[PDB]
């Protein structure tokens, strides 16, 4: 019986000088946010972990992170490098900025041959997020173009310290994603949640408006569709210094063409994460509270 794969986007964890960023032992036992994700993924029935990282911090990643999980669950590393491009394309001379989150996803294409989740490395998704996702992924074995995402409510994801950037979702009555677009600067300004769109117009959002927090469920055909769109991307923006190939962009394109459908899973879990440094004590407090309530042991790994 198949168990789904957890694919963790960890390529951003390095410093700019060949080392791993300082780890934050933020839970009451000194565990990291990533640790809570892995703990819950295991509990939810995920069968293996894949991390996309970069070679520049591989040594410390193996020393400080893989040692926590080895023997608890199978783990594998894949590597996001600038020169890992489709046959026929070369990396521009001046390019230094990584190609983007969906390029990072493409790095898992040979290692992942079953339904899989994609999540960020430093966001707290909550146990039920992993539960609904694992359950759905189990149903997707052998399918093409039938995906999912775990929806959160925008009003639960804001910061009192400044604006946040969220994948704002349009979802129809069948719980299917019809559109997703990254919006920056979302803030609750005296009672109402708003942002400004491309045309500088202010738009408001209901407290319960669905957003993506980059927790997705895919099948391996997703790698092939992504490669197709990556070629298009490189052709159009490959010579640009700061262009990026993002998951929401690709997903949006596939649903608009009808080649994919994405079910939005309305979890009861609540997200948290550190957007601004001032947000951190609140996250420390929430992990302490969940631990006192018995949701987690004091020490995870």
TrEMBL record:
Gene3D superfamilies: Spore Coat Polysaccharide Biosynthesis Protein SpsA, Chain A. This is Conserved domain protein. It comes from Porphyromonas gingivalis (strain ATCC BAA-308 / W83).
């Amino acid at each position: 019986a198949m168990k789904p794969t957890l694919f963790v986007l960890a390529a951003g964890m390095g410093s700019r000088y060949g080392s791993l960023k300082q780890l934050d032992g933020i839970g009451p036992g000194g565990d990291t946010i990533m640790d809570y994700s892995v703990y819950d993924a295991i509990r939810a029935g995920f069968g293996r972990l894949v991390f996309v990282i970069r070679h520049s911090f591989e040594k410390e990643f193996r020393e400080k992170i893989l040692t926590k999980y080895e023997g608890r669950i199978p783990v594998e590393l894949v590597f996001q490098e600038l020169d890992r491009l489709p046959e026929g394309f070369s990396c521009p001379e001046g390019r230094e900025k990584p190609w983007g989150t969906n390029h990072a996803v493409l790095m898992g294409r040979d290692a992942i041959r079953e339904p899989f989740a994609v999540i960020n490395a430093d966001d707290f998704y909550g146990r039920n997020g992993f539960e609904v996702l694992a359950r759905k992924l189990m149903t997707l074995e052998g399918k093409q173009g039938e995906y999912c995402m775990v929806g959160y409510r925008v009003g639960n994801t804001l910061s009192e310290s400044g604006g946040v950037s969220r994948g704002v979702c349009q979802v129809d009555e069948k719980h299917l994603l019809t559109g997703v677009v990254e919006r920056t600067g979302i803030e609750r300004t005296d009672g109402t949640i708003s942002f400004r769109d491309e045309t500088g117009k202010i738009c408001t959002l209901a407290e319960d408006a669905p957003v993506s927090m980059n927790m997705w469920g895919f099948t391996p055909d997703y790698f092939d569709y992504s490669e197709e769109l990556f070629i298009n991307f490189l052709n159009a923006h490959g010579q640009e210094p700061k262009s990026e190939f993002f998951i929401p962009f690709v997903v949006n394109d596939l649903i608009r063409s009808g080649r994919a459908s994405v079910e939005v899973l309305d979890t009861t879990a609540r997200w948290f994460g550190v957007t601004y440094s001032d947000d951190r004590p609140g996250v420390v407090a929430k992990l302490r509270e969940l631990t006192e309530a018995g949701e987690y042991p004091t020490k995870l790994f």
